[PDB]
UniProtKB/Swiss-Prot annotation:
Cysteine pairs bridged by disulfides in the record: 3-45, 31-56, 61-103, 89-116
Annotated function: Serves to protect the virus against complement attack by inhibiting both classical and alternative pathways of complement activation. Binds C3b and C4b.
Residue span, Sushi domain: 1-58, 59-118
Subunit structure: Heterodimer with A56 protein; disulfide-linked.
Family stated for the protein in its record: Belongs to the receptors of complement activation (RCA) family.
Protein's cellular compartments: Virion membrane; Host cell membrane; Secreted
Coiled coil start-end: none
UniProt protein name: Complement control protein C3
C-alpha cells in the first residue's frame, strides 16, 4: 500500500514536498488566495487512505464585541480563522464567558465572547 500526493480539496490544493507518502504521512492542503484552511495543518495518509482533510473556505469575522467588556489586545475591523482578542472587562465587572477569544473559521468569535458582568 502507498500514498501518492493527495488529491485536490475544497477549492484548495496540496503541496508538501514529495510524490509518495505511503503511510503516517501528512500534507498541508493549500487553499485559494483568501481562503482559510480549517482542520489539521496537514492531511494524514495512514494505510494508503488519506484522512482528516482540512477545508479551504472563508473565515472572516463579525466583531469580537461584548457587554462593556470589549478587548484591548489584538483587535481589528476584520479577522479570519484566528486573530485572538483578549477581552478587557470595562470596570468592576467579570467577563462571564471567556476573557480571551479568537475569530475561528466560519465567521464568529470562539469561545463565545465574554460578558462583563458583576
Amino acid at each position: 500500500v502507498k500514498c501518492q500526493s493527495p488529491p485536490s480539496i475544497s477549492n484548495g490544493r496540496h503541496n508538501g514536498y514529495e510524490d509518495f507518502y505511503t503511510d503516517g504521512s501528512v500534507v498541508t492542503y493549500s487553499c485559494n488566495s483568501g481562503y482559510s484552511l480549517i482542520g489539521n495543518s496537514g492531511v494524514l495518509c495512514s494505510g494508503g487512505e488519506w484522512s482528516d482533510p482540512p477545508t479551504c473556505q472563508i473565515v472572516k469575522c463579525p466583531h469580537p464585541t461584548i457587554s462593556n467588556g470589549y478587548l484591548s489586545s489584538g483587535f481589528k475591523r476584520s479577522y479570519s480563522y484566528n486573530d485572538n482578542v483578549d477581552f478587557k472587562c470595562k470596570y468592576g465587572y467579570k467577563l462571564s464567558g471567556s476573557s480571551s477569544s479568537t475569530c475561528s473559521p466560519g465567521n464568529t468569535w470562539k469561545p463565545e465572547l465574554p460578558k462583563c458582568v458583576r
